[PDB]
Design an enzyme around this catalytic site. Structure first.
Site, PDB file in Angstrom:
ATOM      1  N   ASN A 161      -0.753   3.068   8.159  1.00  0.00           N
ATOM      2  CA  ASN A 161      -0.596   3.249   9.592  1.00  0.00           C
ATOM      3  C   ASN A 161      -0.349   4.688   9.994  1.00  0.00           C
ATOM      4  OD1 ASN A 161      -1.128   0.591  10.140  1.00  0.00           O
ATOM      5  ND2 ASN A 161       1.015   0.027  10.443  1.00  0.00           N
ATOM      6  N   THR A 191       4.848  -5.984   6.608  1.00  0.00           N
ATOM      7  CA  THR A 191       4.048  -6.008   5.404  1.00  0.00           C
ATOM      8  C   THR A 191       4.975  -6.293   4.217  1.00  0.00           C
ATOM      9  OG1 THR A 191       2.540  -4.414   6.394  1.00  0.00           O
ATOM     10  CG2 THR A 191       2.639  -4.557   3.968  1.00  0.00           C
TER      11      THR A 191
HETATM   12  N1  DAR Z   1       1.821  -0.576  -0.736  1.00  0.00           N
HETATM   13  C1  DAR Z   1       1.209  -0.380   0.390  1.00  0.00           C
HETATM   14  N2  DAR Z   1       1.251   0.771   1.100  1.00  0.00           N
HETATM   15  N3  DAR Z   1       0.442  -1.391   0.985  1.00  0.00           N
HETATM   16  C2  DAR Z   1       0.214  -2.694   0.374  1.00  0.00           C
HETATM   17  C3  DAR Z   1      -1.037  -2.678  -0.497  1.00  0.00           C
HETATM   18  C4  DAR Z   1      -1.341  -4.062  -1.062  1.00  0.00           C
HETATM   19  C5  DAR Z   1      -2.577  -4.016  -1.993  1.00  0.00           C
HETATM   20  N4  DAR Z   1      -3.787  -3.581  -1.265  1.00  0.00           N
HETATM   21  C6  DAR Z   1      -2.314  -3.056  -3.133  1.00  0.00           C
HETATM   22  O1  DAR Z   1      -1.325  -3.076  -3.847  1.00  0.00           O
HETATM   23  O2  DAR Z   1      -3.280  -2.188  -3.216  1.00  0.00           O
END
Ligand code: DAR
Length: 340
Positions: A161, A191
């Site tokens: 974001n 999230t």
């Molecule tokens: N950790 C973060 N900024 N966002 C969650 C990412 C979840 C999944 N795409 C992954 O672990 O790539």
């Protein structure tokens, strides 16, 4: 706090409240724009690069399908997002330029930031050095000081974001979970990796959740991975609530200390939520090298400038199936979105 900060925040609140109380509405229409490329997509909408046909300016247009918003129980959240975005003004928040709705969709037309998400840059390079992480963290600290003073909670801090602009500074995008809260609020949102324990445990929570999320963000920027990681959300939540975190040995002692105070499970002991508020963070030794005013004024040379060719370059964003923006012959969900 210096009277200069108090007076700044008082004016900031006056200006926010005037727009909050009389929101702008219906300030463009879809056929004022050409569609260029889909930049991202989700359960109830998408973000598209568009170009205004008369001025030639590029914008990021968030499009929400009214029927999916209702079904996914996001009505209040979409109204929050637009009402907040049209009322805020701060250097590190993306500017809303127009909004409107039609029979099918809601539209928020924001400045386009061609440098892409911090998440992409972080995953490319692996991890940010502490100075680089600190430069970004300082912008978030100031942004939360601003938002919290307006009684706003952000509730979705994460590198996805945080867009990186032409000067290498942050622009926070995506106000879908932001809310004006006096006291407590209760919605489960965010999230998984970034949720504070009190959200997981279904408590009435406050702005302390944003300071928890800042701890997660700083950890992820400096390590390259988040502090609480697992294959499934419930396993992540067990780790979050446990009160245990492990730090890489390359972290400085000052970084570890700050992070233990942001990633404090007991919200009544968490930095940002104590009697001195944000100043416990701003005065922490990890921030000793930070010139807060210079950051606000964008006078610090950034750690890197994204590579891009111009205001319409999409290279820093990824590729998605290009789908129609269909507008029904009949109005949908009119009553629900009257105030948009
Ligand atoms: N950790 C973060 N900024 N966002 C969650 C990412 C979840 C999944 N795409 C992954 O672990 O790539």
């Amino acid at each position: 706090e210096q009277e200069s900060v108090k007076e700044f925040l008082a004016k900031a609140k006056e200006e926010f409240l005037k727009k909050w109380e009389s929101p702008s509405q219906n300030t463009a229409q879809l056929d004022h724009f050409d569609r260029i490329k889909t930049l991202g997509t989700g359960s109830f909408g998408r973000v598209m690069l568009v170009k205004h046909k008369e001025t030639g300016n590029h914008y990021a247009m968030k499009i929400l399908d009214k029927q999916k918003v209702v079904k996914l129980k996001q009505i209040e959240h979409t109204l929050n997002e637009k009402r907040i975005l049209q009322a805020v003004n701060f250097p590190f928040l993306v500017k809303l330029e127009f909004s409107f709705k039609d029979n099918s969709n809601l539209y928020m037309v924001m400045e386009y930031v061609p440098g892409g998400e911090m998440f992409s840059h972080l995953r490319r390079i692996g991890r940010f050095s502490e100075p680089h992480a600190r430069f970004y963290a300082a912008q978030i600290v100031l942004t939360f000081e601003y938002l919290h003073s307006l009684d706003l909670i952000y509730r979705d801090l994460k590198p996805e974001n945080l867009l990186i602009d032409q000067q290498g500074y942050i622009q926070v995008t995506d106000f879908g979970f932001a809310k004006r809260v006096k006291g407590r609020t209760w919605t489960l949102c965010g999230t998984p990796e970034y949720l504070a324990p009190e959200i997981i445990l279904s408590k009435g929570y406050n702005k302390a959740v944003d300071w928890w999320a800042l701890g997660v963000l700083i950890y992820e920027m400096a390590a390259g991975y988040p502090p609480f990681f697992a294959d499934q959300p419930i396993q992540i939540y067990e780790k979050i609530v446990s009160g245990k975190v492990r730090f890489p040995s390359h972290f400085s002692s000052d970084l570890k200390d700050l992070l233990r105070n942001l990633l404090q499970v007991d919200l009544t002991k968490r930095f940002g939520n104590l009697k001195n508020g944000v100043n416990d963070i701003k005065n922490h030794k990890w921030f000793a090298t930070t010139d807060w005013i210079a950051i606000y004024q964008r006078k610090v040379e950034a750690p890197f400038i994204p590579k891009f060719k111009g205001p319409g370059d999409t290279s820093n964003f990824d590729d998605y199936e290009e789908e129609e923006i269909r507008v029904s012959i009949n109005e949908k969900c009119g009553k629900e979105f009257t105030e948009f």
